[PDB]
């Protein structure tokens, strides 16, 4: 047999309840946001497939990271890095 000692402050329990409620709700909402983001990307892969067939240059450049020149060999993209040219060294012909 024994005797049970009770703490005189319950604020640990109420704090636990508050934190648990907030954690559960925020985790739920963020899980939904993450799942929606995942589905959106898996969903827009189709737009990206059907845009690269219009002009592969822009899609390939924005995708790889560099500024590359690309073409399509069927179901793949063949790329090649583009060489920079200084701004001041261009002439536009008048006509």
């Amino acid at each position: 047999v024994e005797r049970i000692k009770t703490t005189s402050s319950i604020e640990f329990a109420r704090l636990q309840f508050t934190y648990n409620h907030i954690q559960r709700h925020v985790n739920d909402m963020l899980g939904r946001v993450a799942i929606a983001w995942c589905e959106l990307q898996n969903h827009e892969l189709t737009l990206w497939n059907e845009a690269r067939k219009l002009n592969p240059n822009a899609i390939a450049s924005v995708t790889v990271g560099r500024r590359v020149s690309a073409r399509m060999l069927g179901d793949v993209m063949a790329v090649s890095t583009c060489v920079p040219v200084a701004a001041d060294n261009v002439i536009v012909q008048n006509s």
Binding site: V33, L45, G74, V76
Partner: protein, 48 residues
């Protein structure tokens, strides 16, 4: 001239050169760029 194409086939690719079958390839044999925007959402850790 210069014809060479990859085509999606099964789970991999089939590679043709000059209108003649050359060989098959797996998906891993090609560098994969990504059209995905990463979102590394973690979760409120448990606390007691």
């Amino acid at each position: 001239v210069g014809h060479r194409r990859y085509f999606t086939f099964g789970g991999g690719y089939v590679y043709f050169e000059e209108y003649a079958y050359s060989h098959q390839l797996s998906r891993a044999d090609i560098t994969t760029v990504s059209t995905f925007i990463d979102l590394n959402i973690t979760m409120l850790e448990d606390h007691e």
